[PDB]
Amino acid sequence: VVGGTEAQRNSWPSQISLQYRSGSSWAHTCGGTLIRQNWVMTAAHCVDRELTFRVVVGEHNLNQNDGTEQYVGVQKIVVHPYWNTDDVAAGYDIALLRLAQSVTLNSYVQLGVLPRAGTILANNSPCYITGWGLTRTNGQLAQTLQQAYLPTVDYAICSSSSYWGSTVKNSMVCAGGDGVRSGCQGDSGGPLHCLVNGQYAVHGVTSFVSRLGCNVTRKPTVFTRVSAYISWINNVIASN
Ligand SMILES: O=S([O-])[O-]
Ligand SMILES: [Ca+2]
């Protein structure tokens, strides 16, 4: 997250860190959202490599013991059947991970609230991005979870030529684009939390930023629109 503020320890309890095994150690690569005690939602692109993955729930500082973490293996990866690694702009950047065991819920580990199917946010709706991703273009990961206020940009504006043009699809949410605040590498797969009827719900899965940099004026961060995939998510969980 570029231009964020440090998140409080108990603000975003559905956020997870998706990590891969790197020799003798584990490295954060993506975010995700805990959606059941044994299922995580993340970006398909985060799991294209055939690595060993684990999920950490209850994480705040990647590099220190917080006394709240639970570490769990990934038992099954279900990528959207239409995902194409070579065409991120086509969409379908969503995957579900079945965890090897159920996590324990507490004030640091809670399920994310999903929107109703088909829900579209008005322009300039209040949302926050969270993650441990780079804090500057071509910078370094955050140690502590960051948040940034990232209001939505509706499809008509986002798909206009001075924004993203035809690269964005109606199956995506755009947020931000002020040139100061954005997602960045290592935020991928994580949530966009948006306030609807008094409750934060997870409306986006972080998918991509510009090749020119993370925080680029009129190139909002782009998310998979979770409300486009409710039927798919429910079908996967019911059959696995
Ligand atoms: O997957 S990287 O683009 O955050
Ligand atoms: Ca920690």
Short mmCIF file of C-alpha atoms and ligand atoms in Angstrom, two decimals:
data_model
loop_
_atom_site.label_atom_id
_atom_site.label_comp_id
_atom_site.label_asym_id
_atom_site.label_seq_id
_atom_site.Cartn_x
_atom_site.Cartn_y
_atom_site.Cartn_z
CA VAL A 1 0.00 0.00 0.00
CA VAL A 2 1.44 3.38 -1.11
CA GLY A 3 0.43 6.38 1.01
CA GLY A 4 -1.24 4.31 3.77
CA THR A 5 -1.46 4.63 7.52
CA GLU A 6 -0.68 1.79 9.97
CA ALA A 7 -3.80 -0.27 10.66
CA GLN A 8 -4.84 -0.94 14.34
CA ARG A 9 -4.26 -4.60 15.35
CA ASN A 10 -8.00 -5.51 15.44
CA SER A 11 -9.43 -3.36 12.57
CA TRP A 12 -9.36 -5.87 9.69
CA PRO A 13 -9.58 -9.36 11.18
CA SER A 14 -10.46 -11.10 7.85
CA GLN A 15 -7.13 -10.11 6.29
CA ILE A 16 -4.66 -12.96 5.77
CA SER A 17 -1.04 -13.18 4.58
CA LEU A 18 -0.45 -15.77 1.83
CA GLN A 19 3.16 -16.99 2.09
CA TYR A 20 5.31 -19.39 0.07
CA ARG A 21 8.24 -21.51 1.22
CA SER A 22 11.62 -19.98 0.25
CA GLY A 23 14.45 -22.38 1.22
CA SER A 24 14.35 -22.50 5.04
CA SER A 25 11.93 -19.58 5.44
CA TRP A 26 8.46 -18.30 4.45
CA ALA A 27 7.94 -15.18 2.34
CA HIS A 28 4.77 -13.05 2.09
CA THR A 29 3.58 -12.87 -1.53
CA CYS A 30 -0.14 -11.85 -1.44
CA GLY A 31 -3.09 -10.95 0.69
CA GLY A 32 -6.40 -12.74 0.99
CA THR A 33 -9.71 -12.75 2.88
CA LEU A 34 -10.85 -15.47 5.29
CA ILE A 35 -14.40 -16.32 4.12
CA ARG A 36 -15.04 -19.57 6.07
CA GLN A 37 -13.08 -21.13 8.91
CA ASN A 38 -11.39 -23.34 6.25
CA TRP A 39 -11.56 -21.16 3.07
CA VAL A 40 -9.62 -18.13 1.88
CA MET A 41 -10.40 -15.94 -1.13
CA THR A 42 -7.40 -14.52 -3.03
CA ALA A 43 -6.33 -13.61 -6.58
CA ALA A 44 -5.74 -16.41 -9.12
CA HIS A 45 -2.51 -14.76 -10.22
CA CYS A 46 -1.10 -15.18 -6.69
CA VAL A 47 -1.22 -18.99 -7.02
CA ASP A 48 -0.06 -19.45 -10.80
CA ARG A 49 3.39 -20.64 -9.41
CA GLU A 50 3.48 -24.27 -8.18
CA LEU A 51 4.93 -23.38 -4.77
CA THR A 52 4.17 -24.55 -1.29
CA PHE A 53 1.74 -22.01 0.27
CA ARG A 54 0.57 -21.35 3.80
CA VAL A 55 -1.86 -18.84 5.24
CA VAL A 56 -1.31 -16.75 8.33
CA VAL A 57 -4.38 -15.38 10.14
CA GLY A 58 -4.15 -12.98 13.08
CA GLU A 59 -1.02 -11.38 11.59
CA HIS A 60 -0.02 -7.76 12.17
CA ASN A 61 3.83 -7.56 11.98
CA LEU A 62 5.34 -9.99 9.44
CA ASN A 63 8.72 -9.98 11.20
CA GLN A 64 7.72 -10.18 14.93
CA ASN A 65 5.66 -12.50 17.11
CA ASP A 66 2.33 -10.73 17.75
CA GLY A 67 0.99 -13.55 20.00
CA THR A 68 -2.18 -13.81 17.83
CA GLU A 69 -1.04 -15.70 14.67
CA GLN A 70 -2.31 -19.07 13.46
CA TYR A 71 -0.36 -20.75 10.66
CA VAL A 72 -2.20 -23.21 8.37
CA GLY A 73 -1.34 -25.10 5.24
CA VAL A 74 -3.19 -24.90 1.93
CA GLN A 75 -4.79 -28.27 1.05
CA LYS A 76 -6.60 -27.40 -2.27
CA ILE A 77 -6.42 -24.52 -4.72
CA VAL A 78 -9.52 -23.81 -6.84
CA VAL A 79 -8.82 -21.18 -9.53
CA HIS A 80 -11.68 -19.70 -11.53
CA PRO A 81 -12.02 -21.92 -14.65
CA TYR A 82 -11.87 -18.89 -17.00
CA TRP A 83 -8.64 -17.43 -15.49
CA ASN A 84 -5.90 -17.01 -18.09
CA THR A 85 -2.41 -16.21 -16.67
CA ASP A 86 -1.51 -14.44 -19.98
CA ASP A 87 -4.62 -12.09 -19.89
CA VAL A 88 -5.12 -10.42 -16.46
CA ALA A 89 -7.28 -7.69 -18.25
CA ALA A 90 -9.84 -10.43 -19.18
CA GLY A 91 -10.68 -10.70 -15.47
CA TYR A 92 -11.55 -13.86 -13.50
CA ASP A 93 -8.57 -13.03 -11.15
CA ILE A 94 -10.04 -15.00 -8.21
CA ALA A 95 -9.19 -18.26 -6.43
CA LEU A 96 -10.37 -20.12 -3.36
CA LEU A 97 -8.00 -21.95 -1.02
CA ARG A 98 -9.19 -24.78 1.18
CA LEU A 99 -7.12 -24.80 4.39
CA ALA A 100 -5.72 -28.00 5.91
CA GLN A 101 -7.55 -27.22 9.20
CA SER A 102 -10.22 -24.83 10.45
CA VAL A 103 -8.86 -21.72 12.15
CA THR A 104 -10.13 -20.53 15.53
CA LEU A 105 -12.19 -17.31 15.42
CA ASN A 106 -11.42 -14.51 17.95
CA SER A 107 -11.09 -10.64 17.96
CA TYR A 108 -8.07 -11.01 15.54
CA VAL A 109 -9.55 -13.71 13.22
CA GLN A 110 -13.03 -13.19 11.75
CA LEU A 111 -14.84 -14.03 8.54
CA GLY A 112 -15.11 -11.36 5.87
CA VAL A 113 -18.58 -10.23 4.93
CA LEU A 114 -19.34 -10.72 1.22
CA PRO A 115 -21.72 -8.47 -0.72
CA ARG A 116 -25.01 -9.59 -2.19
CA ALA A 117 -24.70 -10.88 -5.75
CA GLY A 118 -24.76 -8.13 -8.42
CA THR A 119 -24.18 -5.20 -6.01
CA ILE A 120 -22.48 -2.19 -7.70
CA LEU A 121 -21.12 0.72 -5.62
CA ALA A 122 -21.94 4.37 -6.46
CA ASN A 123 -19.00 6.49 -7.65
CA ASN A 124 -16.84 7.76 -4.76
CA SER A 125 -18.04 5.13 -2.28
CA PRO A 126 -15.90 4.89 0.89
CA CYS A 127 -13.51 1.94 0.87
CA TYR A 128 -10.15 1.01 2.38
CA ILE A 129 -7.42 -1.18 0.89
CA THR A 130 -5.29 -3.18 3.34
CA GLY A 131 -2.08 -5.10 2.92
CA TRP A 132 1.63 -5.68 3.50
CA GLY A 133 2.55 -4.82 -0.10
CA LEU A 134 5.23 -2.37 -1.23
CA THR A 135 4.97 1.12 0.29
CA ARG A 136 6.48 2.80 -2.83
CA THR A 137 6.77 1.78 -6.45
CA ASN A 138 9.83 -0.52 -6.67
CA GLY A 139 10.17 -0.24 -2.86
CA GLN A 140 9.91 -2.79 -0.09
CA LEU A 141 7.15 -4.66 1.71
CA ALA A 142 5.57 -3.14 4.83
CA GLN A 143 6.38 -4.80 8.16
CA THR A 144 3.00 -3.87 9.68
CA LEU A 145 -0.42 -4.00 8.02
CA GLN A 146 -1.20 -0.78 6.19
CA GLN A 147 -4.53 0.79 5.18
CA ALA A 148 -5.38 3.52 2.71
CA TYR A 149 -8.67 5.27 1.97
CA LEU A 150 -9.45 4.43 -1.64
CA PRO A 151 -12.88 5.65 -2.83
CA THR A 152 -14.42 3.90 -5.82
CA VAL A 153 -14.30 5.14 -9.43
CA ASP A 154 -17.33 3.86 -11.29
CA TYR A 155 -17.09 1.77 -14.45
CA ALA A 156 -18.07 4.64 -16.79
CA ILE A 157 -15.19 6.83 -15.56
CA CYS A 158 -12.69 4.00 -15.04
CA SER A 159 -13.20 2.58 -18.59
CA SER A 160 -12.86 6.04 -20.15
CA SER A 161 -9.77 6.62 -22.32
CA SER A 162 -7.95 8.98 -19.79
CA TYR A 163 -8.28 6.24 -17.06
CA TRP A 164 -7.94 2.52 -17.98
CA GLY A 165 -9.99 2.39 -21.22
CA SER A 166 -10.91 -1.12 -22.45
CA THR A 167 -8.44 -2.78 -20.00
CA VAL A 168 -11.08 -2.59 -17.26
CA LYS A 169 -14.22 -4.74 -17.47
CA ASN A 170 -17.55 -4.48 -15.63
CA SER A 171 -16.40 -7.55 -13.55
CA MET A 172 -13.86 -5.25 -11.86
CA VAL A 173 -13.94 -2.40 -9.31
CA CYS A 174 -11.61 0.57 -9.63
CA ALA A 175 -10.61 2.58 -6.55
CA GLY A 176 -8.24 5.44 -5.93
CA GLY A 177 -6.24 7.05 -8.75
CA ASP A 178 -5.27 10.23 -6.81
CA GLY A 179 -1.51 9.71 -7.50
CA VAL A 180 -0.73 9.46 -3.75
CA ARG A 181 -2.57 6.37 -2.40
CA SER A 182 -2.75 2.92 -4.07
CA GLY A 183 -2.29 -0.76 -3.85
CA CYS A 184 1.07 -2.09 -4.92
CA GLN A 185 2.87 -5.42 -5.44
CA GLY A 186 2.26 -7.76 -2.51
CA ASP A 187 -1.24 -6.34 -1.86
CA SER A 188 -2.64 -8.57 -4.65
CA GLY A 189 -5.31 -10.98 -3.50
CA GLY A 190 -6.26 -8.89 -0.48
CA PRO A 191 -9.51 -7.10 0.28
CA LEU A 192 -11.09 -3.80 -0.62
CA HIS A 193 -13.35 -3.11 2.38
CA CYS A 194 -16.31 -0.82 1.61
CA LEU A 195 -18.83 0.62 4.06
CA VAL A 196 -22.39 -0.34 3.08
CA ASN A 197 -25.45 -0.01 5.41
CA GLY A 198 -23.12 0.52 8.38
CA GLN A 199 -21.02 -2.60 7.81
CA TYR A 200 -17.67 -3.14 6.08
CA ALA A 201 -17.94 -5.78 3.38
CA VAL A 202 -15.29 -7.10 1.02
CA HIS A 203 -16.19 -5.78 -2.44
CA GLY A 204 -12.82 -6.32 -4.17
CA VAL A 205 -9.91 -8.69 -4.51
CA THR A 206 -6.76 -6.66 -5.43
CA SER A 207 -5.79 -7.61 -9.00
CA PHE A 208 -3.50 -5.13 -10.77
CA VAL A 209 -1.92 -1.68 -10.96
CA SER A 210 -0.25 0.15 -13.85
CA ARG A 211 3.02 -1.06 -15.41
CA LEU A 212 4.12 2.62 -14.99
CA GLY A 213 3.88 2.39 -11.17
CA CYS A 214 1.61 1.81 -8.23
CA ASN A 215 0.41 5.37 -7.46
CA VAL A 216 -0.32 6.93 -10.87
CA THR A 217 -2.86 9.70 -11.35
CA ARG A 218 -5.99 8.37 -13.19
CA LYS A 219 -4.77 4.76 -12.97
CA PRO A 220 -6.78 3.52 -10.00
CA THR A 221 -6.02 0.23 -8.39
CA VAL A 222 -8.12 -2.52 -10.05
CA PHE A 223 -9.90 -5.26 -8.12
CA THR A 224 -11.92 -8.31 -9.05
CA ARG A 225 -15.56 -7.38 -8.26
CA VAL A 226 -16.50 -10.00 -5.61
CA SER A 227 -20.26 -9.45 -6.21
CA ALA A 228 -19.85 -10.87 -9.78
CA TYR A 229 -18.66 -14.23 -8.33
CA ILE A 230 -21.03 -15.01 -5.41
CA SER A 231 -22.69 -17.96 -7.24
CA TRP A 232 -19.23 -19.38 -8.16
CA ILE A 233 -17.86 -19.00 -4.59
CA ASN A 234 -20.98 -20.63 -3.06
CA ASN A 235 -20.82 -23.51 -5.61
CA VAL A 236 -17.13 -24.23 -4.89
CA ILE A 237 -17.56 -24.30 -1.13
CA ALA A 238 -20.73 -26.47 -1.37
CA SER A 239 -18.94 -29.13 -3.61
CA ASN A 240 -15.53 -29.31 -1.74
O1 LIG B 1 1.05 -10.36 -7.30
S1 LIG B 1 1.78 -9.17 -7.16
O2 LIG B 1 1.35 -8.37 -8.41
O3 LIG B 1 1.19 -8.49 -6.02
CA CA B 2 3.62 -11.41 13.49
#
